[PDB]
mmCIF file with all atom_site columns, C-alpha atoms and ligand atoms in Angstrom:
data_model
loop_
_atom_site.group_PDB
_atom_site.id
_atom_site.type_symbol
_atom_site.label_atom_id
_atom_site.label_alt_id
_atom_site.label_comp_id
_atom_site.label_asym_id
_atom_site.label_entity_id
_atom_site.label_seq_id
_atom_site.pdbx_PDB_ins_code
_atom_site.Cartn_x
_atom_site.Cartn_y
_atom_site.Cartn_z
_atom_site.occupancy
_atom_site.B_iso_or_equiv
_atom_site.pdbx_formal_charge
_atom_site.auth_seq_id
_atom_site.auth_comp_id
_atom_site.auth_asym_id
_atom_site.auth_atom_id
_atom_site.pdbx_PDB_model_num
ATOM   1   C  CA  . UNK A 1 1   ? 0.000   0.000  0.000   1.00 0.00 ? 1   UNK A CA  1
ATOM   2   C  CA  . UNK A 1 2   ? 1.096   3.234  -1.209  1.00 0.00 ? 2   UNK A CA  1
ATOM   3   C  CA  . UNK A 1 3   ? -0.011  5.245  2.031   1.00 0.00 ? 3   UNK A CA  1
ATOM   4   C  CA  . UNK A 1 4   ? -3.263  7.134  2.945   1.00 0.00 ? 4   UNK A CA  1
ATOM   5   C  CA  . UNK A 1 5   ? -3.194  10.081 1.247   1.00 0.00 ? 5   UNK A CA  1
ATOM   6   C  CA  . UNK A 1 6   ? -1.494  8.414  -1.673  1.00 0.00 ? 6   UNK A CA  1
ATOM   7   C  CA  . UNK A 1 7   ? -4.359  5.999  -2.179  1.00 0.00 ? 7   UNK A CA  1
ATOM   8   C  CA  . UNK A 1 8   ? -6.682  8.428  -1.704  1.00 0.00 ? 8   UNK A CA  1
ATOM   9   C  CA  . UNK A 1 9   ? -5.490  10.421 -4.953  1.00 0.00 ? 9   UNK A CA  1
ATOM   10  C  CA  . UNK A 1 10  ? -5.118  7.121  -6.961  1.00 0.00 ? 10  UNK A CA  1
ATOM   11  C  CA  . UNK A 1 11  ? -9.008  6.535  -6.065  1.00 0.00 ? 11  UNK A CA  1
ATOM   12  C  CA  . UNK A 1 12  ? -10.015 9.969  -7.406  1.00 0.00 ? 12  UNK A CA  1
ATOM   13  C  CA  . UNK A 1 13  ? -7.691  9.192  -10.356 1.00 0.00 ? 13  UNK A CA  1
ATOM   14  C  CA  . UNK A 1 14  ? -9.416  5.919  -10.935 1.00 0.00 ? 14  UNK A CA  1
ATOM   15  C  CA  . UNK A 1 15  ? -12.595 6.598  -10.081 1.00 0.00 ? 15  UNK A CA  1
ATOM   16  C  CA  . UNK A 1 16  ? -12.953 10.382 -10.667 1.00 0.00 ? 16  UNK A CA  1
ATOM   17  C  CA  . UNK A 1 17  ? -10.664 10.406 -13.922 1.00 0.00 ? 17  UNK A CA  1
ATOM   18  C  CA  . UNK A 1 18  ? -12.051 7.601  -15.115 1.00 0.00 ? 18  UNK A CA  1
ATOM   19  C  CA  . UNK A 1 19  ? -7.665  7.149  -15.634 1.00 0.00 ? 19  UNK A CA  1
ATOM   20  C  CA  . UNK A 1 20  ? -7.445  3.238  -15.490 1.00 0.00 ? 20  UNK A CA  1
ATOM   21  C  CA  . UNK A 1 21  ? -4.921  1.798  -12.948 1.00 0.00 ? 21  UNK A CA  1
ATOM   22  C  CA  . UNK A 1 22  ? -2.128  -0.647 -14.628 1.00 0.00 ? 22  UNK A CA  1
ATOM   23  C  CA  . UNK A 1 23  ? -1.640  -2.385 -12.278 1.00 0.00 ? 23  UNK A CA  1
ATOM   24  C  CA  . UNK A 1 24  ? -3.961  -4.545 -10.159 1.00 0.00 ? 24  UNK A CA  1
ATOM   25  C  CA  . UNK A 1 25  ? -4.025  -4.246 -6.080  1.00 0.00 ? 25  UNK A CA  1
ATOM   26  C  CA  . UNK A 1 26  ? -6.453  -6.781 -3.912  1.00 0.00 ? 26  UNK A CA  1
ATOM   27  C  CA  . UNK A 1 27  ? -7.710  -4.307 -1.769  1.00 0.00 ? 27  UNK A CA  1
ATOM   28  C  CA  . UNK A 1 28  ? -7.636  -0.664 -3.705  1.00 0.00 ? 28  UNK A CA  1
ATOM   29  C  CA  . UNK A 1 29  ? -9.100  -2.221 -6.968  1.00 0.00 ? 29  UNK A CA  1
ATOM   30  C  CA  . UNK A 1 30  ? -12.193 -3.676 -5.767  1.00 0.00 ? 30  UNK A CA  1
ATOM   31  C  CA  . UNK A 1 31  ? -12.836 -0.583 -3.811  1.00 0.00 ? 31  UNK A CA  1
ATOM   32  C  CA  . UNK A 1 32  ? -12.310 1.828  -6.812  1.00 0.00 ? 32  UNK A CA  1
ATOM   33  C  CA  . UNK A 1 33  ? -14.422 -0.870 -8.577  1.00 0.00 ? 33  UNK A CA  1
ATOM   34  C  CA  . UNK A 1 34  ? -17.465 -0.172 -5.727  1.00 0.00 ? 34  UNK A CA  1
ATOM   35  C  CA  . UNK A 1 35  ? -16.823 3.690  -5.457  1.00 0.00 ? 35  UNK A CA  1
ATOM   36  C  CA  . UNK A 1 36  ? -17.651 3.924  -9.079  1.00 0.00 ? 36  UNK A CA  1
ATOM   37  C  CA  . UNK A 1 37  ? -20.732 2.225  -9.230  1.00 0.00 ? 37  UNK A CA  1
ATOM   38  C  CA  . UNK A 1 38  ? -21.559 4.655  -6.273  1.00 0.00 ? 38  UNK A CA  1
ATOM   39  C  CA  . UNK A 1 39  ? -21.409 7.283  -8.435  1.00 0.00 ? 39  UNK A CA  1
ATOM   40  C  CA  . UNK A 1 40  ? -23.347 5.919  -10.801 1.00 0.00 ? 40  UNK A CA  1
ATOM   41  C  CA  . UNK A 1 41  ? -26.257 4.858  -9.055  1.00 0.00 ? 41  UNK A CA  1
ATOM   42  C  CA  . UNK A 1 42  ? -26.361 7.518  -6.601  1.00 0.00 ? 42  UNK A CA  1
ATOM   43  C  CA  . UNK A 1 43  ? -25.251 10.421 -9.886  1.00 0.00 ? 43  UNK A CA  1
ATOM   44  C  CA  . UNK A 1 44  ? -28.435 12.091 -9.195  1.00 0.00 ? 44  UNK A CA  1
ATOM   45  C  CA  . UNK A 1 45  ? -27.565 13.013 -5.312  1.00 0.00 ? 45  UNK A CA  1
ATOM   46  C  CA  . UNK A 1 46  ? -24.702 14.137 -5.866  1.00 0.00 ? 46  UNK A CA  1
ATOM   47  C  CA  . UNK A 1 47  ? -25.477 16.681 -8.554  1.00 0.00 ? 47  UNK A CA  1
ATOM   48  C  CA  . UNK A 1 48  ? -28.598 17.627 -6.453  1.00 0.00 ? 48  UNK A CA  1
ATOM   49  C  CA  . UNK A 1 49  ? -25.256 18.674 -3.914  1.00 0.00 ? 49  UNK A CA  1
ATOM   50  C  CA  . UNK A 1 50  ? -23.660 20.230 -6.366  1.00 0.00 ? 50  UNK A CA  1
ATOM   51  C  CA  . UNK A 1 51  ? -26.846 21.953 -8.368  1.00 0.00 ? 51  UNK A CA  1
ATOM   52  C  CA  . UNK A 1 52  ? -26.011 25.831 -7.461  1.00 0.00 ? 52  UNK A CA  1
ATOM   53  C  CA  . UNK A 1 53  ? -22.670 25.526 -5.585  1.00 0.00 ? 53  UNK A CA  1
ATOM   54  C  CA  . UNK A 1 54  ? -20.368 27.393 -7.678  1.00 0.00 ? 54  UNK A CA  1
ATOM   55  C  CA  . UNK A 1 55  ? -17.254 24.909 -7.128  1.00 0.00 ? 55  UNK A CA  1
ATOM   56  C  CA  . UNK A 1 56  ? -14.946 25.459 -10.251 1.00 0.00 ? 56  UNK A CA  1
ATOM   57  C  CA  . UNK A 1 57  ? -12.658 27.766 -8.770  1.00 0.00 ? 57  UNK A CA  1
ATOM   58  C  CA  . UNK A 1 58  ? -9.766  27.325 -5.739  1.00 0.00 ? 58  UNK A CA  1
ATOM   59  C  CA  . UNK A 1 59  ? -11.993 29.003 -3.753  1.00 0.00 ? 59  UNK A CA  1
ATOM   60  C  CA  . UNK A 1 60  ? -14.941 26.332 -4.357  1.00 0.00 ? 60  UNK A CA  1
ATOM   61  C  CA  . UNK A 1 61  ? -11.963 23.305 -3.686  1.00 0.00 ? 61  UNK A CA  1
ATOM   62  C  CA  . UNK A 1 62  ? -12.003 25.039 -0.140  1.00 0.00 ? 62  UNK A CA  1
ATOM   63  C  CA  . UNK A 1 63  ? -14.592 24.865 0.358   1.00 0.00 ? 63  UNK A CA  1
ATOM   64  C  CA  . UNK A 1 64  ? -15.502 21.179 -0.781  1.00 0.00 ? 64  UNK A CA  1
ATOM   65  C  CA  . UNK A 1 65  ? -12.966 20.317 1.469   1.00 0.00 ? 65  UNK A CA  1
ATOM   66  C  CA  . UNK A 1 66  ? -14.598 21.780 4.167   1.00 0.00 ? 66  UNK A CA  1
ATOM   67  C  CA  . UNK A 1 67  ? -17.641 20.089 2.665   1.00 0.00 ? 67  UNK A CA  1
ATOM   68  C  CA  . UNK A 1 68  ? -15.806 16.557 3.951   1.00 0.00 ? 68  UNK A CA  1
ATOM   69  C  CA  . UNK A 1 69  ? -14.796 17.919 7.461   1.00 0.00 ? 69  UNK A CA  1
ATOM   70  C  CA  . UNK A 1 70  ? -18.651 18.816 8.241   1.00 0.00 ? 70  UNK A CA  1
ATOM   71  C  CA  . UNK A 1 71  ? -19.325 15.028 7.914   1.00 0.00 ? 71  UNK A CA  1
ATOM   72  C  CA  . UNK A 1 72  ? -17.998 13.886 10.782  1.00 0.00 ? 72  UNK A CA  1
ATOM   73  C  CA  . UNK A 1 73  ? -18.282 17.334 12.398  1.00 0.00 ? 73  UNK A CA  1
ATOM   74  C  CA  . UNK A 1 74  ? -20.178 15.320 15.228  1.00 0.00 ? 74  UNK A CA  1
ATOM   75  C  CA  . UNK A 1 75  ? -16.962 13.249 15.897  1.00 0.00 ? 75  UNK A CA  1
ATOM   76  C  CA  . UNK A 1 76  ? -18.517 10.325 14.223  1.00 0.00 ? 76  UNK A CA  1
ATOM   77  C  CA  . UNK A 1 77  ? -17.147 8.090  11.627  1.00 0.00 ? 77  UNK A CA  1
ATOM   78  C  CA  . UNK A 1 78  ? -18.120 4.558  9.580   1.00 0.00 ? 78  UNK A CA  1
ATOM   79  C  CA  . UNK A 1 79  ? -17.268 2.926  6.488   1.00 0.00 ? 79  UNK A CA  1
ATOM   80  C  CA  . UNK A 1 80  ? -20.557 4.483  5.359   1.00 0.00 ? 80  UNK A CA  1
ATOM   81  C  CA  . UNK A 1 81  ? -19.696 7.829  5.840   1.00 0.00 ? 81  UNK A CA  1
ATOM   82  C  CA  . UNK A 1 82  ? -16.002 6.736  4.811   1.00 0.00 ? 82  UNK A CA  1
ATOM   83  C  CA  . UNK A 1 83  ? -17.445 6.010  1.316   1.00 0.00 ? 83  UNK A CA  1
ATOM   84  C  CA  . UNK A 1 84  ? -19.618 9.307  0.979   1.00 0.00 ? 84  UNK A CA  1
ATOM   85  C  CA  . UNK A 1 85  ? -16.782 11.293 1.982   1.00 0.00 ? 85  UNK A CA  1
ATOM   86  C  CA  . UNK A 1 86  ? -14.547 9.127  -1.162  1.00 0.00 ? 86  UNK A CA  1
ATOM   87  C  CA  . UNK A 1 87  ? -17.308 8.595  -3.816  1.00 0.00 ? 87  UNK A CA  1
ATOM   88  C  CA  . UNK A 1 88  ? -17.761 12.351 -3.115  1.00 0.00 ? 88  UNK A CA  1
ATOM   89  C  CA  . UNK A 1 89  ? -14.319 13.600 -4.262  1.00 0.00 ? 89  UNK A CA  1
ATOM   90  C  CA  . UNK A 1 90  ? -14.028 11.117 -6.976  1.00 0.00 ? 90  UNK A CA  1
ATOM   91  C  CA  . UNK A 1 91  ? -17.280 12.766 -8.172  1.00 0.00 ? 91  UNK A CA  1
ATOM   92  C  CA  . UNK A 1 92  ? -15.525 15.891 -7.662  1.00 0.00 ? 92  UNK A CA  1
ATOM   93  C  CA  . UNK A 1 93  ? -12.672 15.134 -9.987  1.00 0.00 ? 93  UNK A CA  1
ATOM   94  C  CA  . UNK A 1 94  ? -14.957 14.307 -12.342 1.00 0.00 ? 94  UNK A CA  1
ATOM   95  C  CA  . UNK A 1 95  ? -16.533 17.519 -12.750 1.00 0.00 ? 95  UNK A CA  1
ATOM   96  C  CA  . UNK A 1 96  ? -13.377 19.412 -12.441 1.00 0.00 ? 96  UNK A CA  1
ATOM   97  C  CA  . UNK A 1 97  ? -11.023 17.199 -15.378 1.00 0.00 ? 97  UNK A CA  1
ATOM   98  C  CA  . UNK A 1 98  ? -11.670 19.410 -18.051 1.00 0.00 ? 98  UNK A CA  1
ATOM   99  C  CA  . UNK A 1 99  ? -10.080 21.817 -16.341 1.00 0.00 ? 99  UNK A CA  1
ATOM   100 C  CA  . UNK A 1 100 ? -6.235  21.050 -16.047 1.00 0.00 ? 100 UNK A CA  1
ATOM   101 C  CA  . UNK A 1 101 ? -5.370  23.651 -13.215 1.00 0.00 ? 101 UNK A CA  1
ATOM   102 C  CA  . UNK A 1 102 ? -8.544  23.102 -11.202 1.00 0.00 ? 102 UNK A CA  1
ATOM   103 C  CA  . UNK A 1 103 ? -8.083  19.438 -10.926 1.00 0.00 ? 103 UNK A CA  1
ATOM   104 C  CA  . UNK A 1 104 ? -5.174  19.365 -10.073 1.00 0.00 ? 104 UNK A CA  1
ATOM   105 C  CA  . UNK A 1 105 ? -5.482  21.571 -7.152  1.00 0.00 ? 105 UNK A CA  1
ATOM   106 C  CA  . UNK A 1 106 ? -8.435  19.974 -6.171  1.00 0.00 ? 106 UNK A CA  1
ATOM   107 C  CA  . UNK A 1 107 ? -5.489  16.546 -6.231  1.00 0.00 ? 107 UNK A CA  1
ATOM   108 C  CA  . UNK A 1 108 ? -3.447  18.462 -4.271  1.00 0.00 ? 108 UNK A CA  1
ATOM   109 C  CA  . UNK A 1 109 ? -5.678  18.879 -1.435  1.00 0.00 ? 109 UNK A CA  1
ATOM   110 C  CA  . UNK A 1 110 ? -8.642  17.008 -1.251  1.00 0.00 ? 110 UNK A CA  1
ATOM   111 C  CA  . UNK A 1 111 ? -6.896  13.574 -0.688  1.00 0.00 ? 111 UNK A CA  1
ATOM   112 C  CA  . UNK A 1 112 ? -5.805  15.169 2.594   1.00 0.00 ? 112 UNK A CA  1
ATOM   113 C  CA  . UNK A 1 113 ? -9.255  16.212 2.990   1.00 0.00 ? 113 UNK A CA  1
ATOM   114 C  CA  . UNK A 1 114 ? -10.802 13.069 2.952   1.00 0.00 ? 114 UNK A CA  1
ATOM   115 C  CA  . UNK A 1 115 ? -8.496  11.509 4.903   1.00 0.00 ? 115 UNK A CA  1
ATOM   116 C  CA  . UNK A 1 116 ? -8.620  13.823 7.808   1.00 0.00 ? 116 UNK A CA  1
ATOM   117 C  CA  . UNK A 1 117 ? -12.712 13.963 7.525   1.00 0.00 ? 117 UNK A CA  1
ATOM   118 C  CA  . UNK A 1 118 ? -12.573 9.940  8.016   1.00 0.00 ? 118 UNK A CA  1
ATOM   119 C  CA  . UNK A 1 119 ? -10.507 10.603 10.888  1.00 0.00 ? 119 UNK A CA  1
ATOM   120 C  CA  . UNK A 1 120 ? -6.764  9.158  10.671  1.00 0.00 ? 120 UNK A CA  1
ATOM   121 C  CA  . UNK A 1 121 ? -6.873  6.783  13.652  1.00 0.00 ? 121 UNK A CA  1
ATOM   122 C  CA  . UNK A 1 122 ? -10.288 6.169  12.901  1.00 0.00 ? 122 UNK A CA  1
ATOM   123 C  CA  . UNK A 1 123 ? -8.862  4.181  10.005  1.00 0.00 ? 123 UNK A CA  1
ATOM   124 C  CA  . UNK A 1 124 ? -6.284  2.749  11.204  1.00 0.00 ? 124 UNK A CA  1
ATOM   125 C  CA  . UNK A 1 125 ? -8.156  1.656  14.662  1.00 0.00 ? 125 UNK A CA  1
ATOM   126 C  CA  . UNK A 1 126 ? -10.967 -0.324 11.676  1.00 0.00 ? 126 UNK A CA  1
ATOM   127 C  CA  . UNK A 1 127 ? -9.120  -2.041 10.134  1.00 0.00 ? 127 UNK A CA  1
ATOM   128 C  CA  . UNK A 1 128 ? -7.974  0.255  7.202   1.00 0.00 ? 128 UNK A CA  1
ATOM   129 C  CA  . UNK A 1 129 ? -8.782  -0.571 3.459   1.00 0.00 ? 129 UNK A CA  1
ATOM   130 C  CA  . UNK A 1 130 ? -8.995  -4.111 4.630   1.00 0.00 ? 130 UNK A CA  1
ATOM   131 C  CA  . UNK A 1 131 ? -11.866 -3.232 6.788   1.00 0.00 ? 131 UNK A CA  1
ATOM   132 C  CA  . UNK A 1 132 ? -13.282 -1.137 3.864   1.00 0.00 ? 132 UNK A CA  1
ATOM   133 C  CA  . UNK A 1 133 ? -13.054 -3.092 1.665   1.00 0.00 ? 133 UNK A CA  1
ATOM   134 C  CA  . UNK A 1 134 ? -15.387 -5.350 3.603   1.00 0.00 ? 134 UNK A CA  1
ATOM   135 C  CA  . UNK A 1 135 ? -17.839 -3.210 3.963   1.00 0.00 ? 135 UNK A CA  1
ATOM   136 C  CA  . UNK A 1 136 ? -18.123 -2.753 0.475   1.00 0.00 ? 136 UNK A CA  1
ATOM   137 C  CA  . UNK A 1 137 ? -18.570 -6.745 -0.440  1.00 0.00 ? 137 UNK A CA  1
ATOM   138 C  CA  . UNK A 1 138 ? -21.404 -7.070 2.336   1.00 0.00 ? 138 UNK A CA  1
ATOM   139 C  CA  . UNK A 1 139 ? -23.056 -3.651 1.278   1.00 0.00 ? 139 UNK A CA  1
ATOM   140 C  CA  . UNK A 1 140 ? -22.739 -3.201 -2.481  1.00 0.00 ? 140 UNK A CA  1
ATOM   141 C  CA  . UNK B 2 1   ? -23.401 32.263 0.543   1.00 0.00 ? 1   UNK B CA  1
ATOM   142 C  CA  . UNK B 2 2   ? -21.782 29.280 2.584   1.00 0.00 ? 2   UNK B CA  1
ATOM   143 C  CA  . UNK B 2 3   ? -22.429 25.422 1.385   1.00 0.00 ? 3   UNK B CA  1
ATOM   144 C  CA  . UNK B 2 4   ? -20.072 23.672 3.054   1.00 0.00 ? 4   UNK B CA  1
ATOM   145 C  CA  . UNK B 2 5   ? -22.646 22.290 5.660   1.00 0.00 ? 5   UNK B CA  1
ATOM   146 C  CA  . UNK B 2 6   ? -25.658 21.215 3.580   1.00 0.00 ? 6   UNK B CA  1
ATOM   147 C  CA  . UNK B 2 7   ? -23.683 19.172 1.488   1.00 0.00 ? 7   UNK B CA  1
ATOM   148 C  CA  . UNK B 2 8   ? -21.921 17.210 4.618   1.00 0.00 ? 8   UNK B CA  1
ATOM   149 C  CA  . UNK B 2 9   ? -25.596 16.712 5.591   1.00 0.00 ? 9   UNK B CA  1
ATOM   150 C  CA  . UNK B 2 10  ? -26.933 15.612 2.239   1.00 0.00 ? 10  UNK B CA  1
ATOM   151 C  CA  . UNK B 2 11  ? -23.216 13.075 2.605   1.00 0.00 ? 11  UNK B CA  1
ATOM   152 C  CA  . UNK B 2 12  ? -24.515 11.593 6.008   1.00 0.00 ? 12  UNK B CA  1
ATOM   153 C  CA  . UNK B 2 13  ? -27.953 11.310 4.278   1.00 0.00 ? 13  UNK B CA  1
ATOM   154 C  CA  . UNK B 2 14  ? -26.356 9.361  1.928   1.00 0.00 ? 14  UNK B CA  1
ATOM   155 C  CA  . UNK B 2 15  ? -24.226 7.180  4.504   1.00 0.00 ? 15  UNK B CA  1
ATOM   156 C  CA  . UNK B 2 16  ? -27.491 6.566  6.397   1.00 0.00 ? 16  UNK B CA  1
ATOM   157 C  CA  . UNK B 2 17  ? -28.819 4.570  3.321   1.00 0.00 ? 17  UNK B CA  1
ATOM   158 C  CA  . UNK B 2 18  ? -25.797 2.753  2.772   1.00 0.00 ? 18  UNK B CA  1
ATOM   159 C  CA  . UNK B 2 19  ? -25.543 1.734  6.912   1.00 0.00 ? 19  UNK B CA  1
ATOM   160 C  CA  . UNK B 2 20  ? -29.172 0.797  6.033   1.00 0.00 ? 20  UNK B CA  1
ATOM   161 C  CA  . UNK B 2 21  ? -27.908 -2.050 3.768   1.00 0.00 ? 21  UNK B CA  1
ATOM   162 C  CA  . UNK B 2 22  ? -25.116 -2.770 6.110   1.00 0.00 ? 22  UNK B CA  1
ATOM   163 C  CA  . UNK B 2 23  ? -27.480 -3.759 9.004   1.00 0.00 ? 23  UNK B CA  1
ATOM   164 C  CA  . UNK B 2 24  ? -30.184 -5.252 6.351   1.00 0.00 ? 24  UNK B CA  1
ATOM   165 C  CA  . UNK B 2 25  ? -31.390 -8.700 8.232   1.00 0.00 ? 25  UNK B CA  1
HETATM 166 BR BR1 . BR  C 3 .   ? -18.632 27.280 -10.875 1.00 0.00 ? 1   BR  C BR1 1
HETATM 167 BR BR1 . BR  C 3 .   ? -8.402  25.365 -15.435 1.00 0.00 ? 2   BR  C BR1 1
HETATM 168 BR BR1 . BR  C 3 .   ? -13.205 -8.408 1.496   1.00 0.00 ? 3   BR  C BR1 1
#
């Protein structure tokens, strides 16, 4: 595993970027394989989110990283949530890829986002993507 | 002018439904 962050980006890459991986891993491929048929079946939410927030801009990035902290604002975190919070930016990417600077801002920081909105030892303390990707077979 | 908040609460929306499945007998 690449570390958190790390994987984080590949996952927007993969499933925001629609950018195939090359190379196969046994927990982050299955996941990005879930987290896109997420957005798919649940592309109607999120643009509902997204109808009038004006988000194409450095500015907007801010605040859709903010957007991930104020899900676990209540100190609260599952793999539920954990998923939201990813399918979210990769949904993110994919509005922002026709736009070369934009995205990869939104790259730059968002990763972090996500990772901090799950909560670090949250993570860790479940099991990481193992215990993700678990969730994902028994839910999706 | 803020949006930040409504869209965190539209995500846990959305994590309800999926926790929903998760503790489907
Ligand atoms: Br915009
Ligand atoms: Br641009
Ligand atoms: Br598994």
């Amino acid at each position: 595993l690449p570390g958190e962050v790390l994987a984080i980006e590949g996952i927007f890459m993969a499933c925001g970027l629609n950018e195939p991986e090359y190379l196969y891993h046994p927990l982050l491929s299955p996941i990005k394989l879930y987290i896109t048929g997420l957005m798919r079946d649940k592309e109607s939410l999120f643009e509902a989110m997204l109808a009038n927030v004006r988000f194409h801009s450095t500015t907007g990035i801010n605040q859709l990283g903010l957007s991930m902290l104020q899900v676990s604002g209540d100190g609260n975190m599952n793999w539920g949530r954990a998923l939201a919070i990813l399918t979210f930016g990769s949904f993110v990417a994919q509005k922002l890829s026709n736009e070369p600077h934009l995205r990869d801002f939104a790259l730059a920081v968002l990763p972090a986002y996500a990772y901090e909105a799950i909560g670090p030892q949250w993570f860790r303390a479940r099991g990481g993507w193992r215990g993700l990707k678990a969730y994902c077979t028994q839910v999706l | 002018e803020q949006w930040a908040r409504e869209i965190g609460a539209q995500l846990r929306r959305m994590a309800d439904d999926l926790n929903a499945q998760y503790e489907r007998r």
